[PDB]
């Protein structure tokens, strides 16, 4: 029941910024993920507990990377791939990042189990890496895409086909944004924070050199994860709050936060291409 | 045969952004390059194959770094060094980056020869590091500066002397931009990409620990190289395309791409100061 103002964005800057970031991410992710997949699955033919997690993470990152050219084309020019490809691209994009973040949490939990009390950790670790991982990471990721699989379709306006997500009301958008941010940030973030601290608290009892290596590594991992993800989720959260009509600063702030969300969503994709460097320490 | 629009740029932001980036690069590059030159050439007095490549790369980076104060002064205030110094600075700037990128490619090729088949690699490696490297990296770099050595001169306008590159027509500018991007990006990039992948494909046959170190290192190198160079060359390529009158979005896009090229050219100089950190793993 208020005056609508439509979004205005820096299209000229986006048309140059999105393709180059997408190209960098595509090249680096293809290289790293293909190399690690070739190293782990194709040649070893005998995998340990951590190798399965690495392979799952690499598969998720490659699945995310595959859809990047479609996003680049959409950013540069009109959508030219049809409704079915729009749905498939959206589904893959939603699945891949959820899978990657849940694999991050699962790797953290496996390290917790393996490091603190390893005397009786054989059976739980084996069961977690064999059976629980599937129903933990892949099934919920597939289930959460039903709204994406249903409500995503291409719209015809003038000449420009629009591959966008259409929701019948703002409530649907809000509920889905809150669920996305809640899961993705809160759950793995809390798991990692309550995990690594206890791990290195227990390490310092009798080991003198592994403790400093772990202190350096966990801080690196936490810094990278948070610097990659926090601004995007902060933008989404404040956008949801202003969509709930509890934040009223006008709507120039709304255009500013929309630009912030777009730029940070473009930037946050570096996680997929940067994961293979971070998690090359698993076997030691 | 169209309406000309002149470039408009954020001079106020540039006057603060260029000096600080140039100062950071100058300090870091002087420190690192002087230290590595002192370590390698002045004290060792007996060099291996990789040490010669390191010394060449350091010399190229130092040559690039030397000219930075002139660029900083030009960005801040008027040109006050004369025509001959303008020509010399342009020649050194053109030579140094070409030399550095070709040395990158040559180091990659030397690693390819040394790692995959080292049983019969003695003579080719020795010949490549002794004779071929000169005519490979230094001679073409000097030859490519003839247009720079000829067409670069200072122009007098009002009071402001302008140290710029003057070409009699747009075709000369286009041909030279295409040659620059083609060589610098396509050749070493393809060499490195087709090199490191095969290297670590061959490593995994019988070695278990060197493979993960190489997988981490090559991905680091590729990510750094591409993140440093791709946006600048993308800006140059799209500027050439819009100069060829095959891209017509107005010319606000032209001002935006000119600003993007300026900022990315300022940012891409971090390669010279960041090389000594990346390539400290050569001897192992």
């Amino acid at each position: 029941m208020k005056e609508p103002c439509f979004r205005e964005e820096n299209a000229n800057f986006n048309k140059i910024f999105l393709p180059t970031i997408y190209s960098i991410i595509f090249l680096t992710g293809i290289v790293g993920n293909g190399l690690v997949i070739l190293v782990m699955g194709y040649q070893k033919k005998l995998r340990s507990m951590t190798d399965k997690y690495r392979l799952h993470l690499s598969v998720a990152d490659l699945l995310f990377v595959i859809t990047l050219p479609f996003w680049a084309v959409d950013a540069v020019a009109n959508w030219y791939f049809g409704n079915f490809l729009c749905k498939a691209v959206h589904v893959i994009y939603t699945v891949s990042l959820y899978s990657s973040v849940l694999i991050l949490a699962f790797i953290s939990l496996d390290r917790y189990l393996a490091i603190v009390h390893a005397t009786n950790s054989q059976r739980p670790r084996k069961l977690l890496a064999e059976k629980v991982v599937y129903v933990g990471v892949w099934i919920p990721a597939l289930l959460l895409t039903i709204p994406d699989f249903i409500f995503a379709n291409v719209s015809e306006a003038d000449d420009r086909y629009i591959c966008d997500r259409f929701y019948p009301n703002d409530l649907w958008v809000v509920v889905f944004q809150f669920q996305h941010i809640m899961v993705g940030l809160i759950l793995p973030g809390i798991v990692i924070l309550s995990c690594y601290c206890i791990i290195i608290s227990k390490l310092s009892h009798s080991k003198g050199h592994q403790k400093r290596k772990a202190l350096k590594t966990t801080v690196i991992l936490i810094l990278a994860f948070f610097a990659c993800w926090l601004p995007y989720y902060i933008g989404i959260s404040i956008d949801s709050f202003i969509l709930l009509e509890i934040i009223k600063q006008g709507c120039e702030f709304e255009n500013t936060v929309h630009k912030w969300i777009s730029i940070t969503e473009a930037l946050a994709f570096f996680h997929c291409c940067l994961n293979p460097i971070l998690y090359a320490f698993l076997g030691a | 045969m169209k309406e000309p629009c002149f470039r408009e740029e954020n001079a106020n932001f540039n006057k603060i952004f260029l000096p600080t980036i140039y100062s950071i690069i100058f300090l870091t590059g002087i420190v690192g390059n002087g230290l590595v030159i002192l370590v390698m050439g002045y004290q060792k007095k007996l060099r291996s194959m990789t040490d010669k490549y390191r010394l060449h790369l350091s010399v190229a980076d130092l040559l690039f770094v030397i000219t930075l104060p002139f660029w900083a002064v030009d960005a801040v205030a008027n040109w006050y060094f004369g025509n001959f110094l303008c020509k010399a600075v342009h020649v050194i700037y053109t030579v140094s980056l070409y030399s550095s990128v070709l040395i990158l490619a040559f180091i990659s090729l030397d690693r390819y020869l040394a790692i995959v088949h080292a049983t019969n690699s003695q003579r080719p490696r020795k010949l490549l590091a002794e004779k071929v490297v000169y005519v490979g990296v230094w001679i073409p770099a000097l030859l490519l500066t003839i247009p720079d050595f000829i067409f670069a001169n200072v122009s007098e306008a009002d009071d402001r002397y302008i140290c710029d590159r003057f070409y009699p027509n747009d075709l000369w500018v286009v041909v030279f931009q295409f040659q620059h991007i083609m060589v610098g990006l396509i050749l070493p990039g393809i060499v490195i990409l087709s090199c490191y992948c095969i290297i670590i494909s061959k490593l995994s046959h019988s070695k278990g620990h060197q493979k993960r170190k190489a997988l981490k290192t090559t991905v680091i190198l590729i990510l750094a190289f591409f993140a440093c160079w791709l946006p600048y060359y993308i800006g140059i390529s799209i500027d050439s395309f819009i100069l060829l009158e095959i891209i017509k979005q107005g010319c606000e896009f032209e001002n935006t791409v000119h600003k993007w090229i300026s900022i990315t050219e300022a940012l891409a100089f971090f390669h010279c100061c960041l090389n000594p950190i990346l390539y400290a793993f050569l001897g192992a």
Epitope: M1, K2, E3, P4, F6, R7, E8, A11, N12, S155, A157, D158, D159, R160, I162, D164, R165, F166, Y167, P168, N169, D170, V173 | Q249, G250, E252, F253
Partner: antibody, heavy 125, light 110 residues
Framework: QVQLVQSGAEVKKPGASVKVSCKAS????????ISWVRQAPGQGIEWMGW????????NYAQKVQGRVTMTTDRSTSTAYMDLRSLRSDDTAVYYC???????????????????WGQGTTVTVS | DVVMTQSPLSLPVTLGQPASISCRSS???????????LNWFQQRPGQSPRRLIY???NRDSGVPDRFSGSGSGTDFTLKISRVEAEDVGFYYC?????????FGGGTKVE
């Protein structure tokens, strides 16, 4: 195919209120806004207002603001426009036109003006 | 806000030769991205207005080749290369770049 159907012609006394209905069929009703426009006899087509039919942020024109309301219905996929303070010059032909595009990530307003309704005429005496 | 005038107000034309109608806006109808939005509507009597060309110089599917538009900046026009007996009706030019939208004055073809 996509189409918009309006109601029948109406005659009303001055000072009364009128309700005009616009049923849209053939496409997703919750992805495009609806603009109501008026054509007077012997006068150019003049805009009055627009309703987004998705978050319901209606917007008016100063010539008509303060005497008109717009209300949508997703279940019936219909748009209603109520006009009060009826005057002598309000006799004209009202059209219901699809205007703008609304989505989660695309909320512009320069993509539309494609399909028009059959148009309903109202007179006063 | 933007005000337009159409020229000429009345253009009687004999069947068999092309005709032109020109309208100019109060200000430049160029959006931030460098694109321009201006469309031309034809209304036959008793019918709802029909969208001939949507973006300037670009026509929809399903109309003859006779209609074609051209223009830029502030000045836009539509030319019919051949007048047919079924091309009689009112013509308007409207812009959708600024809020709110504005229609044209209206041109009658006889």
């Amino acid at each position: 195919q996509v189409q918009l159907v309006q109601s029948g012609a109406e005659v009303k006394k001055p000072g009364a209120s009128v309700k005009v209905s616009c049923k849209a069929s053939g496409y997703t009703f919750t992805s495009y806004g609806i603009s109501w426009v008026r054509q007077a006899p012997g006068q150019g087509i003049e805009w009055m207002g627009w309703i987004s039919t998705y978050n319901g942020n209606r917007n008016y024109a100063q010539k008509v603001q303060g005497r008109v309301t717009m209300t949508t219905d997703r279940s019936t996929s219909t748009a209603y426009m109520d006009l009060r303070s009826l005057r002598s010059d309000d006799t004209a032909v009202y059209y219901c036109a699809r205007h703008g595009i609304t989505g989660a990530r695309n909320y512009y307003y320069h993509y539309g003006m494609d399909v028009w309704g059959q148009g309903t005429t109202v007179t006063v005496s | 806000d933007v005000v337009m005038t159409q020229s000429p107000l009345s253009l009687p034309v004999t069947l068999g030769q092309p005709a032109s109608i020109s309208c100019r806006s109060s200000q430049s109808l160029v959006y931030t991205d460098g694109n321009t939005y201006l469309n031309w509507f034809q209304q036959r009597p008793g019918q709802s207005p029909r969208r001939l060309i949507y973006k300037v110089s670009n026509r929809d599917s399903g109309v003859p080749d006779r209609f074609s538009g051209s223009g830029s900046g502030t000045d836009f026009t539509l030319k019919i290369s051949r007048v047919e007996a079924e091309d009689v009706g009112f013509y308007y030019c409207m812009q959708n770049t600024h809020w709110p939208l504005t229609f044209g004055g209206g041109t009658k073809v006889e």
